[PDB]
């Protein structure tokens, strides 16, 4: 909206006036509400929150889930799942060009049905620990949100970096179900690099 | 509302999180209705309007109206009008400092009654020109809002500037009223004050 | 709602009481948006507004308008528009009573569909000055508003008046259009009628 | 909103434009609803109705008060009630100025826990009438509106005046509770007094 | 809603936080209309307002009533009145335990009709005073709320006691209406039972 | 929504059913308030109005603003700004093809920061007049609607046209503020071009 | 809502602007809801529907009800039924002028109380076929709504036309009622009148 | 929303927790009317109704309607109707690949005006039978929804086969319209193809 | 709702076709704002959540507790604390059957008035470490949600197991309260249990 | 509202009458809601939480930050990190009166621009770990809720004690922007203060 002058007298457009006049009647009773709301805080999600994610996916698995219960999803022992993680890490993210912080890892594990029109929720439990049973009954778990359930698990060589996360899924399902698992580790990097520029050798 | 920061973990408060998600529900159909209402402009109230305000008050009088009819408010000649114009103007506004212009006069007729407890709106008409009538009939007046009828009237000496607005009120009451008037004449001004300030002699 | 008195106590209407609670719960946030309003003004419709109508009709006539286009509806010369305007004003107003202020005159074009079952709306545009084309092309045209437009136009004999608007109308139509157009003069007059009586002669 | 005049056009503020046509748009249906409730009444207030209030406070009183039970509050017999009743107004009334008309004497009773942090009602029950029982059982008693009951009860010298109410209380409370009485006699009184003034002696 | 602790950060239910906070956004205005309905009074509904309540039904009774029509409820003379109230209501007590009061006396009218599938109201008038008409015309009824017309009326034998109310009910039927009429007499009752027990002789 | 036929029995779609009765509960207490808004008047925005926009961008111009201040944007004597006006409105417009009136020139003035992440506003003076002052006071300005000020200004060669407007922007801002300006002259254009088409030599 | 002009300014009355704004804000997802909806179709009523009524009253017949039952309405053979259609029709239409066709025959029961202030529901049945019963119980019946059950029944002399409906009605009533029936046959005509007219002979 | 594990506590985005307990606070008062409306039915309309459309488009045609009057749109005799609906239908379907059913035969009618801005409505009425009027005049017509009227009419040679529906169109217009007309076939086609593919001989 | 066929129509229920109609009229304003909201997570409560609940209820308290003051409800040494929450656990598990994990132990305080109509809140404070004080003042306390206040706390013999938690509770009551506490420990237990069944002795 | 007694019936204050009547009208759906809500957590914010607030202001520092980039706010080593905590933590603390546990430390980071009229938001990452860049560019940064970033840190002599926390801060600015630092440490105090007086020398 504009101002127009016609001999020495001002106008201005009538939809700007209207919004200006109803925007003194809109606008402090919610602000009350926001005000003792404000006395308590909530966690950002880490993926959509600070810091780099970087998805290493690990591998691919099917199992067929039977009712009231769940299949172990992973069983590496503590070296193995030692060796996966620095491994994968590395080999991605070679050359670490700055200084970085790992300021989480999550096993994820995403799950969907391998076939349509089936119509259900996923159940899961996890243990940071040894074999674990491949097959248990559910008792309480946790219902998972959607299709994704994500375990934060809080070097020059791996013999370098040397010197465990187990998971179980279920469905609430009345009948046998088919499951597609793909098992992922996501990293949050908080990288600090410089405002300095590359430069091809020799620089300057 | 801040950010708090518990082991690499973030954290917000509540009235802000639920504020900005409702900000986005509650923001373009409003903006439809404003931008159709954007073609065409409203003018702006003077007296709130652009340019300083000057109020000379000329005189007050008292009138007894009766129904249907209007009395005449002021009867000065053009030279009287003039005379008066000129000289509460200049005795008021001496020293006139500034490069400045006069961007309208207003002849201002407040009105209210004498007597309490008197339930009526006031009626007017004004001519721009001859003796007039001290008392006319009421035909198709102008409706005053409030108490005030403001008509816009678009030197070294009286005698160099040398080298008239008559008003009618009256009231929609069916028994006679008396009527206290006080009119004025109010300046529009356009100040040009340099962003230079005022030194005792001699400057610097 | 009445007040009774039993006893020494005393009673009112339930409806009139309902009504006075409910008139101090809905009785200023709304005042707010319009005190933000009245730093704005509207101009009254001069029809609706001050001043006595006179409309004095001129002539009716009818033409067929081809799409993307206008026709020229009065070709008057300067002298012949002040013929009609003085001898209509006159022949109608005498005998001229009082004293009288010609607010404005408006050349008022009114237009209708010669036909029924008819959606079209009217577009217009007139001039203020040569003789003009009878068919123009339109070009960002002003949008009559229902089926009138009104131009403000801002003595012994024609003579002693003596010591001109142009209109076209044109329609947003995709076919050809027969229009019945009626011109008036419509005339807004501030009366100055004393607060006197009309007495037979002798007066007293 | 005011009515400003810029060359025979007439103008209004926006705002009261806005609320005179809103005010069309809102003025019925409620109309019908009031005028079918005012086919009955209520009763005013005495204390907030017609005539003075002039309370009289007699005691205070203490007393503890057991589940299911009520304790009597006051039992002067009917000679002391009148005695009371007497000396307290003409003690505080004198003079008498002008003629006047006693419309009603309340007996209130204001009651309050002398413990804070208790959450219960107080249930009341009087008699106007022999000697009272000092506590009874509650037995479809009146609940007690806040912190007070009151009670419409409906000369030279005591002995030509002479030429009993009583009350309970008691609550809803599941344990004893202390209680601090305040009885008072609130006289409605309805003044008659002269358009007259008070003059030193002699008068003229 | 409850208060968790994990390692000195404080938390608390979702629900109860946005409780907490609606309550503020919720809680005056409606308050001022409140406010200014307390300045008047309604009187308690009886049978459901203090002291108990004894229906003492006296007898059944059927009537066919034509319209615009009353027929007479009740014919006792003065003395019969007296009768069945005084031995209904010794006989329906004896023997009277406490100190009570008679609060009031309702001549309670029940009225049904004797057919179903009928739609009308019914209407009513009483007197309290002679041999009244069997049928009067309908004149300004009391229009009868559902079936219930209730009338307040304001020893040791019946002669001690000695040492009357009508009513006609009639209906807004423009049919001939046979109408079943169950009348009683409600004591209000305000019994003073002392906080005493009951003992089998000899007490203590 | 169609119309179907089964044998004599005629078949509507249910949606245009439904539309059509919730149209009948729709639509007159909106046309109340809408019919005392009609007794005034809109004026309609230039630009988006009637007849051509012509805009003749004359320069840009930067000039660094100090808070309380507003600095002088333009300059020209009465003969250069007419010899701009009607340079830039001939070079551009020529050939003049058709009879056209100017309805008006506006002397626009667009302004913007040069600085991104700057939060204030415009701020406007101008005069149609002598050398005024480069840094003047602000006093009761014109506050900018957006960046856009419109001043409505009201042959063969310059010299035959022969045989000025000054204009002051500040901000509200409380530090010194960087400001690009772009000047226009935009006519407001009445073409009258006829329906008649552009033959080649020689026409038929 | 009209357009004025003053001075190559262009105006509307505010009511139309407002009107227009709030008609963009008020227009599709009702659209979506209709058309979704119009995915299905409603038959029109067919005495509302296309084509002349023409109710050809046979009798009115008196009913005493009992609850649980229905009463035979009407008891003609096939023989009586066609001729009462026959002659009813015929009677009724001649001189049949124009090329017609019966699109329907409804045999209408038009049904009440012959007292009033009865409040209960018509239940019917119908059978189109042999001596039915009288009186037959209430078995799922159709309930009526309102007073109306119509049933769709699908020359020169009645000779050469011949070269039957039952209808059973009883009420939801829990006493005996007194029915009046009014029994007719509602022909559809779909009318195919030639446009032309009627001409006294000799034609032309 | 996904779940997250950080050191045995479960966390769910804030929106699904938001949404799930507003997805139990919304959902039975709606269900109650949805259940009553459930005790009736709506019919399908055909063309977005089960079964294939096949539409045979049979002529274009163009009449001059004069107000409150009706032009034949089709006069086929039988045959022609017969040689026409079998010889457009065999043409377009051959091959008939499969099994199926002629579920229904639509004659569809589509009409426009041949000229823009018209506001008028569509008015029908056709026979299933004679020769015709061409002209009538309307009776209680039915009302086209939209521009289309919609008529159900409910082998090896056409021969084989033989070993008529008319329509009339007018307007609610109160001058002549000319209007096109689009006359078609559409058939309903149940079709009965087997899961069987397609083989190039020879199959196998 | 179900599908109807009559002679190939296809007929729905009115309630189902009204119910998916006002379906996609509700049906994403609302979703982004849950989008927004989704970008933070809330905390599952641990009794409502994953794994078993364990309530081991160590012993009941009465204290007095004055205004503004806190008493300490447990004063433990690490050995005692560690001997209840040992022997308790282990004697109410055994035989612990499955591998399991404690998640948490949550020291739980659950108080309650010992006397009824009284109105104040809990306050807490705890310390996870010395002999503290019995009685302390109230500062900055944390207000107990209702009447619980839950502490995260987060082998063959207690010996073995070998090889402490404060609680402190005030009101926010202005005079001394008698409160009954109870304390528990409440284990949250994540339960591995196969799906194998329990044999008896020899298994197969 | 109170209650009134006048000849045994009871009267109570309208507006009270209305308002209990309106609370059941009011008061269970919201309540399922918060239910839902209730299966969650949210932690208290500590500044408005349990435990007292202890405001260490340390330095103020001014940097201008160019866009796209963060600067270092502090570079501490850990010794300098610690020295200054204890130092301002015990020179403002002494005397440490009472048994208090250090809940947390919080690194305060207050922030705000040097120039009014600049509209951007705050951006900042930490680590809690060696030289760190003076300048890093941003990446994935935590968005500062209004002007402060609040990290959790989680004796005889400074000494005895020994016997660090990074802050960078950028802007979404597109230009540099010159921000003041007010770096404070807030100390959450759990205190344990006896209720005990303090006595002078000596005590009793």
Not at 11 to 23: E, F, M, Q, S, T
Not at 83 to 103: H, L
Not at 165 to 183: M, R
């Given at each position: 909206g504009k101002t127009y002058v016609y001999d020495n007298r001002y106008?201005?457009?009538?939809?700007?006036?209207?919004?200006?006049?109803?925007?003194?009647?809109?606008?402090?009773?919610?602000?009350?509400?926001?005000?003792?709301?404000?006395?308590?805080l909530v966690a950002e999600?880490?993926?959509?929150?600070?810091?780099?994610?970087?998805?290493?996916?690990?591998?691919?698995?099917?199992?067929?889930?039977?009712?009231?219960?769940?299949?172990?999803?992973?069983?590496?022992?503590?070296?193995?799942?030692?060796?996966?993680?620095?491994?994968?890490?590395m080999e991605d993210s070679f050359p670490i060009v700055n200084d970085q912080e790992v300021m989480d890892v999550f096993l994820v594990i995403n799950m969907r049905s391998t076939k349509p029109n089936r119509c259900f929720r996923f159940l899961a439990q996890h243990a940071l620990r040894y074999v674990p049973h491949e097959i248990i009954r559910i008792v309480e778990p946790s219902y998972v949100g959607n299709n994704e359930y994500r375990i934060s698990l809080a070097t020059n060589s791996f013999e370098h970096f040397i010197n465990k996360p187990i998971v179980y899924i279920g469905?609430?399902?009345?009948?046998?179900?088919?499951?597609?698992?793909?098992?992922?580790?996501?990293?949050?990097?908080?990288?600090?690099?410089p405002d300095a520029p590359l430069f091809s050798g020799p620089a300057y």
């Amino acid at each position: 909206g504009k101002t127009y002058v016609y001999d020495n007298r001002y106008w201005k457009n009538l939809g700007g006036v209207i919004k200006n006049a109803k925007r003194r009647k809109h606008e402090e009773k919610v602000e009350r509400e926001f005000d003792s709301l404000d006395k308590y805080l909530v966690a950002e999600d880490p993926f959509c929150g600070p810091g780099k994610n970087q998805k290493l996916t690990l591998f691919k698995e099917i199992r067929n889930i039977k009712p009231d219960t769940m299949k172990l999803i992973v069983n590496w022992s503590g070296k193995e799942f030692l060796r996966e993680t620095w491994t994968r890490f590395m080999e991605d993210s070679f050359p670490i060009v700055n200084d970085q912080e790992v300021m989480d890892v999550f096993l994820v594990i995403n799950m969907r049905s391998t076939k349509p029109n089936r119509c259900f929720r996923f159940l899961a439990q996890h243990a940071l620990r040894y074999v674990p049973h491949e097959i248990i009954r559910i008792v309480e778990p946790s219902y998972v949100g959607n299709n994704e359930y994500r375990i934060s698990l809080a070097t020059n060589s791996f013999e370098h970096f040397i010197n465990k996360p187990i998971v179980y899924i279920g469905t609430d399902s009345a009948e046998d179900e088919e499951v597609l698992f793909e098992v992922s580790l996501v990293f949050k990097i908080k990288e600090f690099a410089p405002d300095a520029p590359l430069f091809s050798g020799p620089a300057y």
